[PDB]
């Protein structure tokens, strides 16, 4: 990463081939944009610094980390960068027009059935348990990929998951105590296992169809103490019993007792296969 030089021949993109559009977030800022000849004209998301040496290294590190990590279907894809003199540092990635998963699920609350049967058009475009388990499975394969390369996300949450074309989700980072593991809060310790705690919170978000975690709770000292003491969220409204138990496994007090992402990939894959088998029967009988 920060040790591996930046290969300009491969990634460098001309600033004048970029037409900056509207903001997607502001914190540096992330804006939508049209890129000509990046891969003729295509939509992309750009992260650029304001017109600070520290903030500069941060964006440059994100860039180097992205090149290093490489490609995976469930991780937003890097397309290029503007790093040479003449203008601001810019990191360009594929644009996901559908936005973050939380806001998307929140918009489908009146379009959900656990599964479909004929006539299926009654549920055209509805979300189902298959979709929810599939989103979870994809994020897990995405994190397994990152974990295999020793990468730690730090802010894994629904707002950082993006929806793509055919129900494909991608892990991103626009760059939140409610998603933080106890040891992260009390010890400022970040590890792959603290990302597992977060995944657990993401699962809750998914099976509550975009609700904000810990509903009706002030995030004060008591919240933190209870978390440390073993208090957990109750099951969301659209969860199956297995999925809620998986959340609980991710919220184990001892980081070493939580499952790994490889185990979650395998486990979620099975819950998906079971759900599918159940569905074929439901469909065949009704
Ligand atoms: C998790 C990790 C591998 C480490 N850091 C990081 C950063 C990103 N970067 C972005 O997600 C990003 C970069 C530049 C511009 N926008 C970004 N994300 C916001 C976005 C992405 C796609 N569509 C709309 C908004 C992606 C993945 C990772």
Swiss-Prot record:
It is found in: Cell junction; Endoplasmic reticulum; Cell membrane. The second and third Ig-like C2-type (immunoglobulin-like) domains are sufficient for VEGFC binding. The modification Phosphotyrosine is found at residue 123. ATP binds at residues 24-30, 47. The gene is KDR. Residues 18-270 form the Protein kinase domain. Detected in cornea (at protein level). Widely expressed. Tyrosine-protein kinase that acts as a cell-surface receptor for VEGFA, VEGFC and VEGFD. Plays an essential role in the regulation of angiogenesis, vascular development, vascular permeability, and embryonic hematopoiesis. Promotes proliferation, survival, migration and differentiation of endothelial cells. Promotes reorganization of the actin cytoskeleton. Isoforms lacking a transmembrane domain, such as isoform 2 and isoform 3, may function as decoy receptors for VEGFA, VEGFC and/or VEGFD. Changing residue 30 to E: Strongly reduced autophosphorylation and kinase activity. This is Vascular endothelial growth factor receptor 2. The chain holds residues 817 to 1171 of 1356 of the full protein.
């Amino acid at each position: 990463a920060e040790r591996l030089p930046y290969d300009a021949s491969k990634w460098e993109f001309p600033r004048d081939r970029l037409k900056l559009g509207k903001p997607l977030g502001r914190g540096g800022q992330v804006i939508e944009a049209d890129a000509f000849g990046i891969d003729t004209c295509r939509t992309v998301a750009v992260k650029m610094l304001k017109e600070t040496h520290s903030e500069h290294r941060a964006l440059m590190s994100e860039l180097k980390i992205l090149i290093h990590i490489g490609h995976h279907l469930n991780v937003v894809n890097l397309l290029g960068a503007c790093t040479k003199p003449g203008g601001p540092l810019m990191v360009i990635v594929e644009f996901c027009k559908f936005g973050n998963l939380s806001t998307y699920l929140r918009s489908k609350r009146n379009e959900f059935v656990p599964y479909k049967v004929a006539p299926e058009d009654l549920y055209k475009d509805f979300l189902t348990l298959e979709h929810l388990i599939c989103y979870s499975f994809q994020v897990a394969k995405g994190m397994e990929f990152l974990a295999s390369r020793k990468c730690i996300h730090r802010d894994l949450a629904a707002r950082n998951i993006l929806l793509s074309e055919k129900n494909v989700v991608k892990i991103c980072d626009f760059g939140p105590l409610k998603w933080m593991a106890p040891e992260t809060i009390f010890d400022r310790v970040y590890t792959i296992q603290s990302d597992v705690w977060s995944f657990g919170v993401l699962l809750w978000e998914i099976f509550s169809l975009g609700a904000s975690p810990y509903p009706g709770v002030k995030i004060d000292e008591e919240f933190c103490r209870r978390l440390k003491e073993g208090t957990r969220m109750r099951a969301p409204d659209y969860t199956t019993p297995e999925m809620y138990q998986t959340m609980l496994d991710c919220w184990h007090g001892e980081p070493s007792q939580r499952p790994t992402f490889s185990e979650l990939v395998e486990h979620l894959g099975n819950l998906l296969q079971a759900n599918a088998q159940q569905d074929r029967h439901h469909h065949h009988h009704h």
